[PDB]
């Protein structure tokens, strides 16, 4: 996956992020909190925000659809996600990804790009 330098982590240290994580898991337990950021140098459009809440049963495939709309991409345009630095399967749900890969600050990080392979 791409070498990410998460703006969310640059701006907030672990303690501050974990405090937010605790608060989000407490107030919205029926939602999966995700931090979404673009791979460096990607030509894809930037997202207005990076903090999103998604249903636990939303699949990666349905997630791709929502993101494509937000960054004005067409179905035939290349779009790849990286979780835990690797590409997830489209049938996996957000709740499943969160259960297996949420960060210690209690957030699930997802990077997006138009490229599928990085050195």
């Amino acid at each position: 996956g791409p070498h990410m330098k998460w703006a969310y982590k640059e701006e907030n240290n672990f303690e501050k992020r974990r405090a937010e994580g605790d608060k989000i898991r407490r107030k919205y337990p029926d939602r999966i909190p995700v931090i979404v950021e673009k791979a460096p140098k990607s030509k894809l459009h930037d997202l207005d925000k990076k903090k999103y809440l998604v249903p636990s049963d939303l699949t990666v495939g349905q997630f791709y659809f929502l993101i494509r709309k937000r960054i004005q991409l067409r179905p035939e345009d290349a779009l790849f996600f990286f979780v835990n630095n690797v590409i997830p399967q489209t049938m996996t749900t957000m709740g499943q990804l969160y259960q297996d890969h949420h960060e210690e600050d209690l957030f699930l990080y997802i990077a997006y790009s138009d490229e599928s392979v990085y050195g």
Partner: peptide
């Protein structure tokens, strides 16, 4: 935070 907002719903995706």
């Amino acid at each position: 935070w907002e719903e995706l």
